[PDB]
Design an enzyme around this catalytic site. Structure first.
Site, mmCIF file in Angstrom:
data_model
loop_
_atom_site.group_PDB
_atom_site.id
_atom_site.type_symbol
_atom_site.label_atom_id
_atom_site.label_comp_id
_atom_site.label_asym_id
_atom_site.label_seq_id
_atom_site.Cartn_x
_atom_site.Cartn_y
_atom_site.Cartn_z
ATOM 1 C CG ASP A 290 33.400 12.975 -25.732
ATOM 2 O OD1 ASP A 290 32.653 12.534 -24.829
ATOM 3 O OD2 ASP A 290 34.105 12.234 -26.449
ATOM 4 C CE1 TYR A 374 36.429 5.961 -27.140
ATOM 5 C CE2 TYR A 374 38.805 5.774 -26.603
ATOM 6 C CZ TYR A 374 37.670 5.376 -27.355
ATOM 7 O OH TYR A 374 37.770 4.393 -28.323
HETATM 8 N N1 LIG Z 1 32.190 10.212 -23.829
HETATM 9 C C1 LIG Z 1 30.878 10.382 -23.215
HETATM 10 C C2 LIG Z 1 30.127 9.050 -23.173
HETATM 11 C C3 LIG Z 1 30.317 8.350 -21.828
HETATM 12 C C4 LIG Z 1 29.982 8.997 -20.645
HETATM 13 C C5 LIG Z 1 30.152 8.350 -19.425
HETATM 14 C C6 LIG Z 1 30.655 7.052 -19.385
HETATM 15 C C7 LIG Z 1 30.994 6.404 -20.569
HETATM 16 C C8 LIG Z 1 30.821 7.053 -21.785
HETATM 17 CU CU LIG Z 2 38.725 4.916 -30.624
#
Ligand SMILES: [NH3+]CCc1ccccc1
Ligand SMILES: [Cu+2]
Ligand SMILES: [NH3+]CCc1ccccc1
Ligand SMILES: [Cu+2]
Ligand code: NA
Ligand code: NA
Lengths: 620, 620
Positions: A290, A374
């Site tokens: 992230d 998240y």
């Molecule tokens: N945490 C980044 C991965 C992600 C990015 C966009 C939608 C779902 C998951």
């Molecule tokens: Cu988790």
């Protein structure tokens, strides 16, 4: 005045002008990262030079550039073209999020897969996921995102309740090509909704909660000057903000009597990684950084009074750059406030008759970020007694899949037909240490059990042992909860009144580190996550445990390459890198929206002061 | 109405009358423990019988007695004479605290030792310390306390700053005999004072702290009925109080829709032990069981509004018996209040446009106790999301010694000439489990790493394994932080809507357990402290992990003798015993009064609910 001040909108506008005039910001360019550089070691010249680092992407397929700019002297200092097959791709752009869905929406292979499942393409959301590096040679040097599909039944539906399993696609977002569409079989799309605001799901809301009112009738005990300099209860620091790292703490110091004593020069969360433990080909590639791949700071929430931050709140509104170089304010992106923290010290003495009670409090600095499903809160705490603590709060919606009929060893069932693959959330704190100055060393402290015998006749003795880490090649350490292992950062040239070196002790939570096989791609790309503690010699360009360009890098960059220099770290300018994380086996209670879970670390003074530093706190 | 109500002053007065009339409370008798008994298993008769257990000591040297009394039927139910050489001595009496100092004050050996150090006997305080069991055969069957001396320079002086090292005495407190006086050499008495209210030490008090005001304008969200029955945010429980254990929680349950679901039948801290790791003969015998030997409940503080408990506080004032059977109220001995606890859940969704934030809160039940130099706060927390947490807060003054010239491997220097021996603080939580009823089992859950290979081609998979504990002989478990080891208590006959057994997961802090040599006296007497987790089959008389009579017991009683029965615990009425503790290497910052340090554990729902149980919480 301060060189650690937040970047201003005017500084951002100057950077854009400089880049434009130099020919580096044409209509096919996009700024993928922009951030102020920290002053170099030896800022005792007062020759302020506000410099900015910029990653420039090219949507037409030209080579991206890394550019350093001086807003002070209105000049491009350096501009290098990047070979991304070598050094990694640039971070994901926010405008690329929807490109994966739009590209797949006209691909014959994609439409064929949706039609076999009777899904209307207009209802199908596609998550834009970082690609990593695996077996596909055609991906080397190209900008790839992978797509996993979720069904939205209506515009306000939570798509996460309806994963489309057995299906994944890879997309080249520069050439606008769908390179592969993989369909391993049809899975029922889980039917139940997960709409946590639907009264049919929530039932009647509680009427039993009475309000709690937290107020400060005389205002808060801390002062903010120069935009971001904090003074509170002998603590002094500057709150910075970086679009990649988020909140950064600079120049953490404690006023001990008449002396301002440094403790930490720079503190940040320099990387996080979420690896998934599902071996299904649909998801076995899934790991997102992230911080390094998406940049957590640019997705910081605007925090509301009374809901996100409660009490007497002071806000900071940091300024970042959008993809075209325009400034954008994140209104109320950082909350700071003090909180009561219970009893600080207490004793009623049988012999002196004195009854003594003092209350504790902490200074809180926090922000919250959202990347897809998240949400994470980042909390820094300063306590009256010298303790520093970081806490990460993980919430949001768990990433979902189908639950296979017959079960799974790597997926939890949350609702009928609905699963949640096992995964971890692993953070890296980078602590540029400055215990009473820059001459620091790290010792590993273990409890020592002793055997019954001569000198220990009753078998009650126990002790402790400290091992100095002298060179980088021996400063890669693992936790050992059994032996109470901690690490002490001390200054061997600064002694307390007992003639012992002043120090701070790092207390870890001792959670599992990276679980993946050491031969996996993720173990190579997230090598920092395989060990609890790393110590390096400070260097200007050694900023991230994964290196500068995480997206699609093949591995090895960052910490393992730094420590190979085997530099002296015994009484030097050093940096501590602490890995800590949560291993998440999702539970039914995590669905349809997750209650907060937490992880973190803390540092406590260890002979830093000459006595308790809270003897001068008054009685409430 | 409730059989779990607190004992009342009237009930205490009836017990005293019954004992008096029966001839068991003559002028040479002292009540060393008095407490209500819990209802027996099968209280579904509504035939209330309030019964009390009493330990009766005899200051003339007769054999003590254990007596059970029914206040309901005004009758002595049983009365047994105790052979204390066999089953252990009775707990230390409060009136014996000063007897050690008075006895030594006329002993020629004691006065000789003080005179060689030029100490005025009128300035010397003697700590009354439990004796343990060691090599001295003449102590078997006798009531012994050991004495360590501290100098008070004036009546308000903190004596702890002036330990008199190299000197210890043993005293028989029934026959009033000083059995031994040991003088191993003269140590300088540390000269600096530790008077933490002296302006010469504190300096000027801070004027920078602004008030924090926490109020509940509509009152608190919890209700108290029947004196001690709590209802708060779907939680239900009874708060009990026992002079040995302190606060006890009964009948912890959660209202899930229309059903009251049990979780824990009884929760207490059933023992604590503080072992010292200094091999010096002056202190190598030193271990006190604050709960079992001294009774932490009878030393509970009266907690002041605004200093000890802040906010909208509701108090309980529990009633105990003094040594003659008279009731005494502990005014404001238990604080309870709710606290804001930050964000509970939060998500901003990119696809649905919904922004969602809910705040958490916790119910706090606490008391504080003082035994000599140490002060402990005991905190039970109930959270909105079903989490239960215990936290112990250790403060007060560290136990001191001389710091030997040349140093020590087992003692920390706090001030010139002043030392603090290494020690631990180890607690035992007794959790009489009732997950959805009394048919419960315990599984040990470990993370499972998997190797790269067939079925795991990318080397990313990881899993978990659960091992059911079926018999007591296999239910003595150790922590393993490396493998994320936790324990799940489930009900195999109560399933959630996914047809999985409902459960709660115990999360331990994974701190070191007892460090002493396994062949030591303390390892035998505090056997519970050598392992992190024990599970026993419930039995009425199996109350304490150390047995009923801890003082001067030779070892083996309690948990190791219970589990030797090897009873079935797979889907039965079971009790979980969790050992947790702090290993304390004292630091300069702990002196002259200790800032709070903490340790504890928590339990979180694990598929107990059918979804998140906080979907019905409203928006602030
Ligand atoms: N945490 C980044 C991965 C992600 C990015 C966009 C939608 C779902 C998951
Ligand atoms: Cu988790
Ligand atoms: N904690 C119980 C041991 C103790 C008792 C009285 C004074 C000092 C120490
Ligand atoms: Cu201690
Ligand atoms: Na440093
Ligand atoms: Na039970």
């Amino acid at each position: 005045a301060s060189p650690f001040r937040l970047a201003s909108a005017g500084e951002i506008s100057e950077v854009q002008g400089i880049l434009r005039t130099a020919g580096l910001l044409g209509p096919e360019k996009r700024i993928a990262y922009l951030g102020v550089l920290d002053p170099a070691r030896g800022a005792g010249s007062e020759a302020e030079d506000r410099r900015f680092r910029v990653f420039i992407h090219d949507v037409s397929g030209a080579r991206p550039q890394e550019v350093t700019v001086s807003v002070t002297n209105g000049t491009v200092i350096s501009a290098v073209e990047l070979d991304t097959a070598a050094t990694g791709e640039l971070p994901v752009l926010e405008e690329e999020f929807e490109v994966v869905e739009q590209l797949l929406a006209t691909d014959e292979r994609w439409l064929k897969a949706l039609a076999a499942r009777n899904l209307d393409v207009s209802k199908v959301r596609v998550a834009p996921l970082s690609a990593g590096v695996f077996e596909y040679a055609e991906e080397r040097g190209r900008r790839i995102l992978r797509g996993l599909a979720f069904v939205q039944d209506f515009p306000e539906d939570s798509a996460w309740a309806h994963p489309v399993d057995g299906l994944v696609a890879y997309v080249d977002v520069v050439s606008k090509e769908v390179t592969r569409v993989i369909d391993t079989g049809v899975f029922p799309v889980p039917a139940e909704h997960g709409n946590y605001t639907d009264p049919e799901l929530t039932g009647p809301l509680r009427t039993t909660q009475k309000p709690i009112s937290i107020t400060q009738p005389e205002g808060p005990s801390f002062t903010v000057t120069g935009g971001n300099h904090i003074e509170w209860e002998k603590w002094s620091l500057d709150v910075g903000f970086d679009v990649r790292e988020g909140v950064v703490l600079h120049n953490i110091a404690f006023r001990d009597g008449d002396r301002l004593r440094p403790i930490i020069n720079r503190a940040s969360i320099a990387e996080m990684v979420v690896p998934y433990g599902d071996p299904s080909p649909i998801r076995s590639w899934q790991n997102y950084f992230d911080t390094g791949e998406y940049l957590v700071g640019q997705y910081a929430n605007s925090l509301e009074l009374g809901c996100d931050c409660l009490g007497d709140i002071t806000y900071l509104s940091p300024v970042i750059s959008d993809a075209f170089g325009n400034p954008r304010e994140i209104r109320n992106g950082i909350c700071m406030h003090e909180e009561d923290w219970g009893i600080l010290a207490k004793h009623s003495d049988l012999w002196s008759g004195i009854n003594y009670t003092r209350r504790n409090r902490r200074m809180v600095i926090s922000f919250f970020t959202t990347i897809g499903n998240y949400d994470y809160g980042f909390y820094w705490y300063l306590y009256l007694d010298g303790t520093i603590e970081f806490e990460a709060k993980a919430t949001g919606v768990v990433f979902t899949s189908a639950f296979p009929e017959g079960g799974s060893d790597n997926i939890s069932q949350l609702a009928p037909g609905l699963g949640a693959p096992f995964h971890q959330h692993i953070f890296s704190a980078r602590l540029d240490m400055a215990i009473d100055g820059f001459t620091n060393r790290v010792e590993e402290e273990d409890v020592v059990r002793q055997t019954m015998g001569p000198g220990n006749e009753r078998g009650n003795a126990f002790s402790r042992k400290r091992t100095v880490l002298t060179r980088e090649s021996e400063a890669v350490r693992e936790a050992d909860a059994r032996t109470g292992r901690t690490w002490i950062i001390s200054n061997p040239e600064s002694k307390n009144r007992l003639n012992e070196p002043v120090g701070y002790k790092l207390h870890a939570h001792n959670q599992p580190t990276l679980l993946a096989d050491p031969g996996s791609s993720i173990a190579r790309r997230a090598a920092f996550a395989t060990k609890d503690l790393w110590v390096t010699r400070y260097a200007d360009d050694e900023r991230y445990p994964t290196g500068d360009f995480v997206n699609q890098h093949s591995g090895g960059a960052g910490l393992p390459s730094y420590i190979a220099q085997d530099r002296d770290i015994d009484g030097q300018d050093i940096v501590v890198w602490h890995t800590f994380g949560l291993t998440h086996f999702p539970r039914v209670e995590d669905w349809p929206i997750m209650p907060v879970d937490t992880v973190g670390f803390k540092l406590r003074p260890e002979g830093f002061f000459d006595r308790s530093p809270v003897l001068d706190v008054p009685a409430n």
